[PDB]
A paper describes a structure:
The ClpXP holoenzyme is composed of a hexameric AAA+ (ATPases Associated with diverse cellular Activities) unfoldase (ClpX) and a tetradecameric serine protease consisting of two heptameric rings (ClpP). Together, the ClpXP complex acts to unfold and degrade protein substrates (Baker and Sauer, 2012). ClpX uses energy released by ATP hydrolysis to create a pulling force that unravels folded protein domains for translocation into the degradation chamber of ClpP. Here, we present cryo-EM structures of the ClpXP holoenzyme from the gram-negative pathogen Neisseria meningitidis engaged with a protein substrate.
Author numbering:
A (entry chain H): 6 to 15, 19 to 198
B (entry chain I): 6 to 16, 18 to 198
C (entry chain P), D (entry chain Q), E (entry chain R), F (entry chain J), G (entry chain S), H (entry chain O): 6 to 15, 18 to 198
I (entry chain K): 6 to 198
J (entry chain M): 6 to 12, 20 to 198
Write the structure that this text describes.
């Protein structure tokens, strides 16, 4: 894709995403990979240094992705001093919904027709080799499953038992249902 | 493709690619399929243009066969959220989510060119339906909710009953610019 | 594979070993249940009823599952024909294989001691493409099949429909003893 | 697949199990309807009429559908030959399989209790490429086939053409009971 | 496919069902017309003339078309051999299949009521690559074949060459009634 | 390909050679007409109108055709914008390329002496799969496009709609002189 | 393909239809000429000479061509064996197929009325890779084969070598009448 | 492969060499253990018990392993049938092949002097995709199979379960002497 | 490939060019490799640009091409004949098929070849596939024959030969040395130093 | 690959072109040969009298592409010195021997291979087409051997023997043969 170039008056020419980063807007678009997550981490670290007090706006339009990649974003969001506000555009599914709920409490938003989906993790990696190797990877996946449900329950002010029920299979929610659930705080209109 | 470079005269000169030059005139293009990446560029441009001037109209030129519903909804909610009116224009074709975003323009400012083709239809797969019957039931229910949401928003855009959109989006409904104007998808047809 | 040839004493008649066992009223369902493998079972069940409508038919099952419609052709043939169809689980009876195993005549459903029996809700009976109206239709048909299978399984096992709905939600693996306690089989053979 | 061999008592004659069932006037249509599978059905129907023009022919159907022209060769052969062709649905009779099922002699169209019968308008009878003039021709031919199928189905089911046009618009799945109420089959076999 | 075996009473002789029908002077052309499928038809036509030069040969056609040269080997064999070759359209007779259908003995060309008959100008008889001189040669040969086919079709149908040139320009689909009115077939069979 | 860089004297400004020609109001349509290549033409036409609404725009066409909707975005932009869009055929203008060539301002449609101009009815504007109801819809839409193109072509050429319907039935290749006599272009350039 | 079985009256003997025609001294060359298909022809020609060295052998040709060396094994066998080898063109005799057709006994080379006979210089008898020294060798060998084929063709046709060199330069398609006038065949069969 | 034919003196009867050895109560398990290869072993074991329930059956194993469920069908058949099943390792008995080797009748488990016997924990009995709940289920089932195999192996070898858990952790290759000392086989044959 | 950057010397300053843009400044246009819509349109764009810079000075068209599309080559051909400045053509390595056509299309007296260049002329191959129905194949065969005659006629005009000579000589691939092409009439001179 | 930048900022190959060094690396194609021709033409204009240094590390390539370089080398006024780095095989060895006599160099462990040409193009189609392409390949084979014999001051019969199959030579053997004039050490 051709990323448009915009001019900032101060003149400085930016691509439109660097221009929005100047306004403390970080985009997570598409699958969460090592490379896309590290760009988010790099932007979060950079924005904290520019101003540790001003809010960072984390715009999420993602179907999910790697858990470890999403956890690098998650720990960076919680570590850095400035509040990270999260906004759901289009969809926040799987780790995208996790990072959406991971925003600062009171500053988690979704657009009115966005779709938010939460579910237990799939394969974090293949389970081949010997039964001893498969047992190890199964145990690690169960630990990740419990860790995700526990952190989700903390984000949503719900019991761990509620998240274990609701993440068993793909749980699709409107913006209103996610607000009632505890994934987001407000729904934006204008 | 090689995107041509054009020179803007100012108070000096600035070299733009022709799409950045048109963005300076508040023209946003949605060309080809609606994807996460192409929709987020539209959202980024809509957000940028609101800050440049919240009062001036934004011109959203659509030549798209459709695409992802969630991607199109990111554009749709951005269009409705931002303060400036988003005028929409159909070039060549506005099909599926392209027709949805066309009808989503500000009422009175939805346009189409005389030989454009506008097609509305119920959504297809928003994603595969594999796995167990319990998983397939969930994805079928989610697709039906999306189908109802799209028909409901389309009926609101067109000032028609939900029952009308449910009939007309059952199978691919192709419309000329005149038929789309009579239907309620667009307001005017441009000639000169 | 080369199927061995055996000689039946009567004069002599040369059989492949599977036709020789069919002479003893033994029908094998081995591997996936397809239109072709299910119709061979149906053809053998129909043939054996004509040979002797009173003698038991022995249906040996070693199958991971397969098509529901193909398995239903076997299922209805088993219930229709006059002779009792005894079922035996060798190696495994999974999905429609477990359904056909439980479909044997009550009191004559067997499993070998180290066999594995797995029951679960059906997967795709066919793709769900096309328009949302087509996907709704195929989703409704799959749900009807899911309910029909759970209802027939509950009848076979003398259990409530609610029990089968819980237990077939995800792949439910059972030993021969667990399947006997569940109600899928009646006896476990040893010698 | 290995087709079992069975012995007919008469001296003795060794048959594969399908030739043995053909001796009992049982013709199988299993799997997709192709030129080759349909011509085998036609060859068997013609052969059975010569053997005995008065005795019923039993046409066992377990088919997801197939070619319309191939199914029409079976259909016209069924109507042409003197002996009644009874039809039985095993597992499934979908698309042209449901058409041939309903095409059986009125009063002798059967289905097994858990069989699935699906009727729908035809899909591509062939690709629609080339120029718009070629595409117009193939679209017109497909519409003529669509009307011909709905008209013959309405005749089989004693229903109005308007009913079949509604009900074949999208995949219409029916249980054996629903197909009996619809008019596709006459009876449901149990024992 | 498994071709069924049938027993002819005479002692007994076991035939596959197609060899049994060849004994009744029935030759099948099923599927595409290839060098191998056409030569089998030629071999059967030559064999049947030797068995009885006076009795009619019944040529059952269910074919979408195929090679022109392959179809011409059948065509010239049909016209050469002394016995009349009656032709019957089952399912479909398209392209060279419709040509061979119309090539039957006048008065003995039949079609089943729901058969589909399609006539059209030939497509590529072979690729047109190489140099412009090679392409000119292959284009001229294709035009000669096109004229030869239209001329022979016009002779079969008792129509003017100009009529066949119009009607074979694009795929011309015909019902059995339209083909009878056109002149491709003489009668439509019902019972 | 490496696009050469040229220097414009004014100070100096470095352009790629296509941006340099756009400065002279020359827009190129080279290769197939796609959504992306058509939108670049539209973007250039819109940009050039704003630079000068009164000066002619020179639209150089070397295209085998492409998407109808993509070509219609160019077509409506050409007719909408105030400045005359002169069209020139280089190498070839086929299908939508010939349509856009004839779409130039009357009196300003040009072709080079050895250019090739081809007009024809549209092919597939999209696949025709799915159910017969879907195929009927896409066939009707293609026929509407076919009539719209022939009607607009007849308007461009000052000919009757019946003439364009004959001449676009199959690929109609024309020299620059034949296209001038037909009405697709107004003049042929030499020097 | 399923090759039909026919019964020869003598007791009875069951043949496949090609072995039955070989009993009548009919040898078929159908499809491309390969090492395996040519050696079968050679084996049949050698066998038929042993059965009766005086009776004619009928060589039916329906072939697009093939290997030159494979065709030469047939050619030398035809000329070596004592009985005359009559040749008949069915459908087509192209390339080495036309060579073997013209290679029949003078006065006994036939073609059916709508057969197509094509003569041309050979293509690659094998790839020409490796070094320029290897390519020179293979080019020289191909030229020797080209001259040998034209020389033998000119002998068969009672024409000058210069005539065959002109006429085999590019694909030369001939009707049965043109091949008779050329000298490739002696008679055209009708009835 | 071409399986040789041998003649048994009795009159004479022609066998393939494997059916001839089955007459001597020799059953071969060669190559991977699949549903089809295991069911042939089961069919042969069942057949041999019927022929003589008292005489030993000789089970020759040359297998790298295979499916656990397939191997369990053989295993339960070996233990169920009345006659002792002696096992012999030729070349190799690995994974389920070593399990079935150790499964022979105690005192009658043999290996050739240079055979290789390998025991190890099972690998994937099936993929572990889907959701974490599905992966947990398949992991639990694999662990149950792992424990069942080690428990049965420990019983065969007269060793503690803890010994087999250590030794099957990774691929444990053993000579015939090491397998005899371990308890997998009883004797090593030389002459 | 990495295209080298060269520095053009001007008044107290330096303009950096890639080496092909630097040669275009000297009115040198390259046609290298197959003739496609994109490569031919670049040649046309350069020919149009060079006419505007100076419609009197010769344009040097360096050709190293095995051939390509006829319509693409015709866009170059008509541009060469239209624009006012003479287009001199030079054969480097090879000028085959449409490459030889464009070589012979240079201004008479200014068509050159290097001493070991190879020039090949032949009738066109497929200008496009010939599928579909026999009516479609007849149309495409007729169009190919018209192109074949047009190419031979223009070649005969370039070479001052009879149309019958070009019809013989383009029947199959006719390879020529620079000397044979000069004697034939495809080029005027052979450069050495 | 990332081409380093050296100090105006040049990539390292444009910097060496400023020193009149032209590289032919890898197979000889239409595009790689035309870059060499463009550089040779450019350098003649920058200075028609100064030597051009043509560094060759090539396994061979197209004959017509190599001939465009060859004729450009002989045409332009400045001497083109050639240096073999790593290897000069097939047309690479031809262009190496094509350097100005007395200025053809090779590095001590370079490998130089001469051989008759392979396919200059496929030989499909009809026997008449194959005869034409075989004749053209033989003319190219004779032209290459004749030009090689001229470069090496040897008889045409010597090159016809020695190029029959792949003839690998050390730098010393190529110097004795006549392909190069000197071997560089320091």
């Amino acid at each position: 894709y051709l990323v448009p170039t915009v001019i900032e008056q101060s003149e400085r020419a930016f691509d439109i995403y660097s221009r929005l980063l100047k306004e403390r807007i970080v985009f997570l678009v598409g699958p969460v990979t090592d490379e896309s997550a590290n760009l988010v981490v790099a932007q979060l670290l950079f924005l904290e240094s520019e101003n540790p007090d001003k809010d960072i706006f984390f715009y999420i339009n993602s179907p999910g992705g790697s858990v470890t990649a999403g956890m690098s974003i998650y720990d960076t969001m919680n570590f850095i001093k400035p509040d990270v506000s999260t906004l759901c555009l289009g969809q926040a599914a799987s780790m995208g919904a996790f990072l959406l709920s991971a925003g600062e409490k009171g500053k988690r938003f979704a657009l009115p027709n966005s779709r938010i989906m939460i579910h237990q993790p799939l394969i974090s990696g293949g389970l081949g080799g010997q039964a001893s190797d498969i047992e190890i990877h199964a145990r690690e996946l169960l630990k990740i499953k419990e860790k995700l449900n526990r952190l989700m329950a903390k984000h949503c002010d719900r019991d761990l038992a509620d998240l274990e029920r609701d993440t068993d299979r793909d749980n699709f929610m409107s913006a209103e249902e996610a607000k009632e659930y505890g994934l987001i705080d407000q729904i934006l209109e204008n």
